[PDB]
Structures are given as structure tokens and as C-alpha cells.
Amino acid sequence: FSQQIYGVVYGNVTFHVPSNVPLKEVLWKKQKDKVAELENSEFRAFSSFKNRVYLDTVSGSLTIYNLTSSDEDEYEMESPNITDTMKFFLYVLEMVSKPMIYWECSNATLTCEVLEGTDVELKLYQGKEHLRSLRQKTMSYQWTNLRAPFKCKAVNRVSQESEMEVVNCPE
């Protein structure tokens, strides 16, 4: 088992583990270090996870609260009567802010940019047409026409915001 999980800074995520036969004990590790456990009928969390994790005693599912970038990592769940691995790679992303659109009339160049966001992609549209996408926080485009306004969308795994603007240039 392997799973890709996307969380937001300061938010939380739950690593859902197949719930059938209740687990008697369960151990969660972040890389090779202990995160939390249900051992000998007692619960305990370790290091940075004390006070910010919840462990489902039935399924063994782990919930991590108040995510921070350091939390981005591979996590593994183990239980005595569970043969196979339960691996989860958690990515912690900051949400995108609203994109800004500006232009230069002289060289008919339109630029879109966005300040905040992790692994952001900017997508540009004019009318109902998707003109381009770039995995960057700034993207420029030389326009051929101004028959419709431009829409720029900033998107990442955990969020998205867009801005729409009409270009004002002398004909």
C-alpha cells in the first residue's frame, strides 16, 4: 500500500487505513521515527506530534493537526496482524493567493503572477480558450487579439484562485 496525500499548512489530514478486523496495537512512523502508537492499551505520541495527532483505535487511521512543512514526509503504519506495509507520502502545501494580471501595450505582452502557493501552476485563458500553463509564479504571453478578457488561474494540489481582466490598449 502507498498513498499520496496533500495537506495545507496549519490544516490537518487523515491517513485512512482499511477498516475491517480491529487492531489491537498500531504504530505510525514518519520515515524511521515514531509518530504515535496504540501499545499495550495505551496511547502516546512523540516529538512534534504530541498534542496534535489523533489515532483511531479501530482502524488505526492517523489524523495530524496543525500541519507544518516539516511534516512533509513518508509515513508508515504497522500492526502485528497486518502483513503488508501502509505507506503514505504527505505533501504540505501553502495555498495560492489571488493572481495579478498586468500588461505592456507596446509589445502586446500580458503577464500573470501570483505571490503565495507551493508548486503553483498558472493557467491563462482568453474567452473560452486555454492559451497556456506554466509551473511558475509568473507567466507572460504575447497576445494576438483582444476580443475577450483574459483569465489567469493559479492552482496547486490544495487550492486555486483566479483573476479576470480586460486589457486596455490603444487600437
Q: Which stretch binds ligand NAG (CB under 6 A): 29-37, 77-85, 104-112, 148-156?
A: 104-112
Specify the 3-state DSSP secondary structure of 139: strand
**Residue 27 or residue 137: which is nearer to ligand NAG going by CB?**
137
**Residue 79 or residue 141: which is nearer to ligand NAG going by CB?**
141
User: What is the nearest approach in angstroms of ligand NAG to the Cβ of residue 11?
Assistant: 5
Q: Is residue 109 a contact residue for ligand NAG (CB under 6 A)? A: yes
Q: Is residue 160 a contact residue for ligand NAG (CB under 6 A)? A: no
Give the position of cell 493567493: 97
Interface with ligand NAG (CB under 6 A), residue from 5, 6, 11, 29:
11
Pairing mode, strands 42-45 and 33-39:
antiparallel
Interface with ligand NAG (CB under 6 A), residue from 107, 144, 145, 168:
107
| DSSP class per residue in 95-120 | PP---EEEEETTTTEEEEE-SS-SS-
Interface with ligand NAG (CB under 6 A), residue from 66, 69, 133, 138:
66
* CA 106 – CA 115 distance, rounded (Å): 26
Q: Is residue 19 a contact residue for ligand NAG (CB under 6 A)? A: no
**Residue 74 or residue 104: which is nearer to ligand NAG going by CB?**
104
* CA 144 – CA 133 distance, rounded (Å): 17
* CA 39 – CA 55 distance, rounded (Å): 12
Please choose, from the candidates 156, 168, 152, the residue with its C-alpha nearest in 3D space to the C-alpha of residue 99: 152
Residues that bind ligand NAG (CB under 6 A): 10-12, 65-66, 68, 104, 107, 109, 142
